[PDB]
């Protein structure tokens, strides 16, 4: 994430390169945390006290 900012900074440092009309469609938002609840299957060894 710190290198993607280096060309843009260079592009930004040379304003004479007419921003290639990057057609930069905005970074599609990291898919939201697979909300898959690892329900830790607590294997409750119920020690049936015979």
């Amino acid at each position: 994430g710190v290198v993607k900012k280096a060309p843009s900074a260079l592009k930004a440092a040379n304003p004479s390169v007419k921003k290639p009309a990057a057609f930069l469609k905005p970074p599609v938002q990291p898919p939201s945390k697979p909300e898959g609840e690892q329900k830790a299957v607590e294997v409750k060894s119920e020690e049936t006290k015979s």
């Binding site: 299957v41 294997v43 015979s50």
Partner: protein, 48 residues
Amino acid sequence: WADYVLPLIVTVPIVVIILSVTLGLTIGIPMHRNKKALQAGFDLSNKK
């Protein structure tokens, strides 16, 4: 002593039956639980 032969024929098989049933339950009940635990453990391993 010696009067007891006819009740010994009744009593011996009954004790054997009780002891056999108890042995069956004592071995049988945990074997079912072990199976379930093993399955659960493998299931969890697979999930992990």
